[PDB]
Design a protein around this ligand. Structure first.
Ligand code: MG
Length: 691
RNA sequence: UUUUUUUUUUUUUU
């Protein structure tokens, strides 16, 4: 049986007296018998031995623990339940007046369900539901019971199918994808089609006549930012970042505000998008669509050709985007800088602005961005980007026809450098104005122990590396023989490995953090940062807009407690990471299906680790990690030797015929090999073998 | 309750 939880006051006293420790529970997915929490000082985490010591806690919960003598601790309370208490799993079935629900997530415990709650068709033939995904909600977990009690929510459908699995990911991670309540939709404008009131135009700087445009993916539905660039007579440039003024449409403390605060961010699945706001805002009103007057909150600079700021300006504005460019369009402009492109290979453009004018703007914005970026890395910036997958979906069926590695081009970077520049400018502005109430975004450095151990590992394999800083590492991960697919492959593998010690970036209230040296963003290597440029799809930006609004005197002094503001930040962090897991799982889902439907898929891969009966590989064409087992390979024998510091795996291939002699193949780390991905019998499961 | 330890990140647009 489990242990009885502690009292509210006993715990509150414990946390206050240091005797008890707070933290976020992490459960080992490979060995669910093991759970961990971070320690306030020591770089080594605290160990939770067994499920009993976990005390019915779940992964993600903010738990309280008491230390044990000879690290090791036991859970004694749960101050905040952060797990959704909802899971995707399968139903099956002595005291047989219950059913056994098995969550796909091994971190989640198995759940008892009352048979009376179960479908009649399941009662008759449970084996019919062997591959039927249900949603189950943990309603309780008794201290005497080994399993937890739950309520069957609904049937999603067959496992492995896209839409059922999608809803499973969304629900399991607590993403609200419901229609918006009527009390929310009444906060929206009621006079449609909505036009900007005349009195506002006077209050704002009217940029509707200026050449402003947007650059986003071809499939973009919610355009948050717009850009502009003029060359001044004195050789300098006037760049402008115009963000949709969502703050205007979302009154603080309204039903619309509360649901936005809850949803915290938009979720970008592969085939669809779970929006933060209603579509009337996300896609029509706030969205900076072309050839329509839009309310914006802008940042404008007078910039050096190198991107150095000469003077800086904030203020509410109003624009009329002359065109909606895609990154492909922008790139074509950049690659053909002195050629009038056929005006049919480009999107519709407002008649009051020529294509040549926009073309020139992109070229100039590229020129500065090119310089802004190059400078950023000289100043010790870290780009640690792994391979990302993009899919091509059959519009008839929705299934994926294929996939490709997403290419991050000059047009992509163009936008990035100015969104960066804008966000920093606002970070400095609100913090300089309201030092105790600034909604900023820091990024701590890597964990000392993990990184130090990784550097040691890299000392072997003949790969000395400097990691004294973010910048030092960045140069190391771009310091290769270059040119060839091997060094590029090794680059990607090392990019992965050095991501483990890295910590997540955090929203935070300025006044709630003492040491300002911790305000730093490790990877960007800057003293201050925040999110401001994407208020349609991110609530953190909305709060910053309200703060910036107050900094310019558009509203009263902010009367929010730093405590309250941190709560918003905490929740924003929670939904942000949760959103990332979902977006990743969505990609994983579609690739699994793609592997299943498009037969076996070939690809080159690089070895990451080597064990005595298997080895891990990074599949290059897809950026997935898979383990290859010697059992699955048609081998006649295989040997494992660890001499030479690094592990090596020697394979002997069994020929299919007596004519062919057995071929040998040594597998060591950073080895380039061919692999094929075949779908297994299980849903969304596929294996890797060495071709 | 998985064919051989938690930390897989950062940045930009969606
Ligand atoms: Mg945009």
């Amino acid at each position: 049986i489990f242990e009885t939880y502690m009292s509210k006051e006993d715990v509150s006293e414990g946390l206050k007296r240091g005797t008890l420790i707070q933290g976020v529970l992490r459960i080992n997915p490979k060995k669910f018998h093991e759970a961990f929490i971070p320690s306030p000082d020591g770089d080594r985490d605290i160990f939770i031995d067994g499920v009993v010591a976990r005390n019915r806690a779940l992964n993600g919960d903010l738990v309280v623990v008491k230390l044990l003598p000879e690290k090791s601790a036991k859970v004694v309370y749960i101050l905040e339940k952060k797990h959704s208490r909802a899971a995707t799993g399968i139903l099956k079935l002595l005291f047989k007046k219950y059913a056994l629900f098995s969550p796909s997530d091994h971190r989640v415990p198995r759940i008892y369900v009352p048979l009376k709650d179960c479908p009649q068709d399941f009662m008759t033939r449970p084996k019919d539901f062997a591959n039927t995904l249900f949603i189950c909600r943990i309603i309780d977990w008794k201290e005497d019971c080994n399993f937890a009690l739950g309520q069957l929510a609904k049937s999603l459908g067959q496992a492995g199918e896209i839409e059922p699995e999608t809803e499973g990911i969304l629900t399991e991670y607590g993403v609200d994808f419901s229609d918006f309540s009527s009390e929310v939709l009444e906060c929206l404008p009621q006079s449609l089609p909505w036009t900007i009131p005349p009195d506002e135009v006077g209050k704002r700087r009217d940029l509707r006549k200026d050449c402003i445009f947007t650059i986003d993916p071809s499939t973009a539905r919610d355009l948050n930012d717009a850009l502009a660039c003029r060359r001044l007579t004195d050789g300098t440039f006037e760049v402008g970042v115009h963000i949709a003024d969502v703050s205007y449409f979302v009154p603080e403390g309204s039903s619309l505000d509360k649901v936005a605060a809850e949803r915290a961010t938009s979720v970008y699945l592969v085939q669809k998008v779970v929006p933060m706001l209603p579509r009337l805002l996300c896609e029509e009103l706030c969205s900076l669509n072309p050839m329509t007057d839009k309310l914006t909150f802008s940042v404008i600079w007078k910039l050096t050709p190198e991107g150095k700021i000469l003077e800086e300006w904030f203020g509410r504005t109003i624009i009329r985007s002359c065109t909606k460019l895609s990154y492909d369009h922008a790139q074509s402009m950049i690659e053909n800088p002195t050629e009038k492109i056929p005006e049919e290979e480009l999107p519709p453009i407002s008649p009051e602005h020529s294509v040549e004018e926009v073309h020139q703007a992109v070229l100039n914005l590229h020129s500065i961005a090119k310089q802004l970026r190059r400078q950023r890395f000289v100043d010790g910036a870290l780009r640690l980007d792994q391979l990302k997958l993009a899919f091509t979906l059959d519009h008839e069926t929705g299934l994926p026809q294929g996939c490709h590695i997403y290419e991050y081009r000059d047009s992509n970077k163009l936008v990035e450098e100015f969104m960066l520049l804008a966000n920093m400018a606002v970070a400095h502005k609100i913090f300089r104005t309201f030092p105790e109430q600034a909604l900023l975004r820091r990024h701590p450095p890597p964990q000392t122990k993990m990184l130090s151990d990784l550097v040691e590992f890299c000392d072997q394999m003949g790969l000395p590396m400097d990691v004294s800083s973010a910048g030092a590492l960045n140069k190391s991960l771009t310091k290769t023989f270059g040119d060839d697919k091997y060094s590029l492959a090794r680059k990607e593998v090392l990019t992965n490995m050095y991501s483990r010690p890295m910590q997540m970036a955090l929203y935070f209230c300025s006044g709630m953090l003492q040491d300002q040296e911790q305000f730093r963003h490790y990877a960007l290597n800057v003293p201050l940062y925040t999110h401001f440029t994407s208020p349609i799809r991110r609530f953190a930006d909305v709060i910053v807009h309200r703060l910036l609004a107050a900094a310019l005197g558009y509203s009263e002094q902010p009367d929010v407690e730093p405590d309250t503001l941190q709560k918003q930040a905490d929740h924003c962090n929670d939904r942000r990471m949760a959103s990332k897991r979902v977006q990743e799982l969505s990609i994983g889902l579609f690739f699994a299906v793609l592997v299943k439907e498009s037969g076996p898929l070939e690809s080159e891969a690089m070895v990451m680790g080597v064990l005595n009966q298997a080895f891990d590989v990074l599949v290059l064409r897809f950026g997935v990690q898979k383990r290859i087992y010697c059992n699955a390979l048609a081998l006649r024998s295989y040997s494992f030797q660890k001499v030479g510091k690094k592990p090596e795996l020697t394979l002997v291939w069994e020929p299919d015929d007596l004519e062919e002699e057995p071929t040998q193949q040594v597998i060591t780390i950073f080895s380039l090999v061919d692999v094929v991905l075949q779908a297994e019998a299980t849903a969304l499961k596929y294996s890797a073998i060495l071709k």
